[PDB]
Design a protein around this ligand. Structure first.
Ligand SMILES: OC[C@H]1O[C@@H](O[C@H]2[C@H](O)[C@@H](O)[C@H](O[C@H]3[C@H](O)[C@@H](O)[C@H](O[C@H]4[C@H](O)[C@@H](O)[C@H](O)O[C@@H]4CO)O[C@@H]3CO)O[C@@H]2CO)[C@H](O)[C@@H](O)[C@@H]1O
Length: 255
């Protein structure tokens, strides 16, 4: 049983898979109230009821990203032992990720249910910079838009509640200190079960970045991690009540 009630990181093992969970309030300067993240062997849950919020940097827009992840998160220079990542993008034949989720939140709160990876030039960087790429996949959003601008749409299949469907995904792109790409599902899902192959998003990102002057040799980058969580808040958010539950998690990485 893992229980955290303040920002921090703990490793755990779920269905035989080594993982890290981070009660991540990375852009919050100060807060009052409670946060609690728990793994009990069957599910990971997160709940927050916080007030007196202010951002460390309003230019980054969101306030936090409570999440769990598989692999090496560059910003925290951390990976649980036993992960198959990082591996070069070119060595990934397929990477299926499956998870059930139930997300709740007060109506006005900016929030998403987003998964992501960081593709870096070296295997164990401690930050992303020019030449690196952040790729997100958003299954749900409320009062929150990705960064950058919407440039394209892609039709990418996934299995929703056990049924294969064709999702329509908008691709937003931004050139900041690193390249940011976010694929946002046009029909957001707040609760359900999803299974998909991360390779389809890598393939679409490689194409979208094929003419970039910043990103070179996309397939030689290292696919470092796979994070699953909920970003939340905006620079005007003063209090936040929300939570989530993740269950039935599995992955199949073919390298
Ligand atoms: O930086 C170190 C820190 O990173 C954390 O990971 C962050 C990424 O750094 C961050 O790029 C990403 O957040 C995006 C978010 O998806 C967008 O919704 C938001 O969009 C804004 C945009 O910025 C505005 O220009 C526009 O007008 O409005 C939209 C919203 O409507 O842009 C942000 C930029 O932050 O999210 C990742 C997770 O939060 C790591 O988790 C942490 O450990 C690191 O310390």
């Amino acid at each position: 049983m893992v229980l955290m009630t303040k920002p921090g990181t703990s490793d755990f093992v779920w269905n035989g898979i080594p993982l890290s969970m981070e009660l991540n309030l990375w852009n919050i300067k100060e807060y009052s109230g409670s946060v609690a993240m728990k793994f009990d062997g069957e599910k990971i849950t997160f709940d927050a009821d916080i007030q007196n919020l202010s951002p460390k940097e309003p230019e980054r827009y969101v306030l936090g990203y409570p999440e769990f992840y598989y692999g090496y998160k560059p910003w925290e220079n951390h990976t649980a032992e036993g992960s198959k990542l990082p591996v070069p993008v070119s060595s990934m034949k397929s990477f299926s990720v499956e998870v059930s989720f139930d997300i709740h939140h007060e109506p006005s709160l900016p929030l998403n249910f987003a998964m992501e990876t960081w593709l870096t030039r070296e295997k164990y960087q401690t930050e992303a910079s020019i030449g690196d790429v952040e790729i997100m996949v958003w299954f749900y959003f409320n009062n929150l838009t990705p960064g950058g601008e919407k440039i394209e749409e892609f039709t990418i299949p996934f299995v929703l509640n056990g049924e294969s469907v064709e999702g329509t995904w908008e691709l937003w792109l931004a050139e900041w200190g690193w390249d940011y790409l976010a694929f946002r599902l046009k029909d957001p899902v707040k609760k359900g079960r999803v299974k998909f192959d991360v390779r389809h998003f890598l393939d679409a990102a490689g194409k979208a970045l094929s003419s970039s002057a910043r990103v070179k040799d996309f397939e030689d980058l290292y696919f470092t991690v796979w994070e699953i969580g909920t970003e939340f808040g905006s620079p005007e958010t003063k209090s936040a009540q929300f939570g989530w539950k993740f269950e039935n998690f599995s992955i199949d990485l073919e390298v």
